[PDB]
């Protein structure tokens, strides 16, 4: 059996790793970041202050969806916790 919290944690680590690597140029880190941000509809994490501020700055969060402001963002860690706890679907 694979435990919810163990994979959620591993998924946030994977993502935090790619976020780091992305901000030191590693064109693949950037692809992973863009993928996570588009598929999960998120941008950075509040838990990752230093990395999140380097990242907006890198224009790795398009909006598209955003029609009023692009100032406000979902936290990817929270999106990952909610994916594994089955809380992302529009019921």
């Amino acid at each position, epitope marked *: 059996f694979v435990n919810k919290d163990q994979i959620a944690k591993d998924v946030k680590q994977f993502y935090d790793q790619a976020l780091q690597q992305a901000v030191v140029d590693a064109n693949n880190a950037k692809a992973v970041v863009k993928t996570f941000h588009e598929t999960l509809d998120c941008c950075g994490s*509040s838990t990752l202050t230093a990395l999140t501020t380097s990242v907006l700055k890198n224009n790795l969060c398009p909006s598209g969806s955003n029609i009023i402001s692009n*100032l*406000f963002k979902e936290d990817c860690h929270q999106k990952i916790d909610d994916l594994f706890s089955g*809380k992302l679907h529009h019921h």
Partner: single-chain antibody
Amino acid sequence: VMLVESGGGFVKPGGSLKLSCAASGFTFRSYIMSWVRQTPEKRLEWVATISGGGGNTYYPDSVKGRFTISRDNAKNTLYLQLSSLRSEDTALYYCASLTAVGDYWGQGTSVTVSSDVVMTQTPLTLSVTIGQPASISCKSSQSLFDTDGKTYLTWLLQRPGQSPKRLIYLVSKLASGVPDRFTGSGSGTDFTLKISRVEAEDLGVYYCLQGTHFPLTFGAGTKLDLK
């Protein structure tokens, strides 16, 4: 369909109150939710914004450190804890999905405390006759043109008795349930709402709103009136 606010009231300088907003009829948890206050003089001010999942909270400096926005997704409730309250915090506080794809507003709950891009709007009052063309200007102190290549200029209209409602976003794009008598235009710092032939549900207060620069700011408003 519904946002219902409560917990407003009357308080002394330096006191506390916690406001609530009960949502129903949309997928609450996936909306970035806001509080927007409207002062006795009918100015709108952005107060706080929280991400769908609760992780990112945002505040202008005027309330930052004093107010805490929060949300309970399982209960479909939005909160605003008010503390160290000041006279100039007196206003009608609106729960709203202000920046979300759908435009929902509560009806507002009132607080009375009692012992940045400048947005300009010309004229302050337009009095008109039904079927007349109308033209309101909104001017900003910096370009609202984002790196996005989007221009986050938004028009809202508050009808007498009514909470405010989105009418135009991204300068020219009409919101839902909005007729084509409405037309927004402009670029840079200069923006224009034209009503070709005013009908009687065009009357109220028009506000522009920029979303390009932190913190969110509102023009003081133009009153549409007949005569």
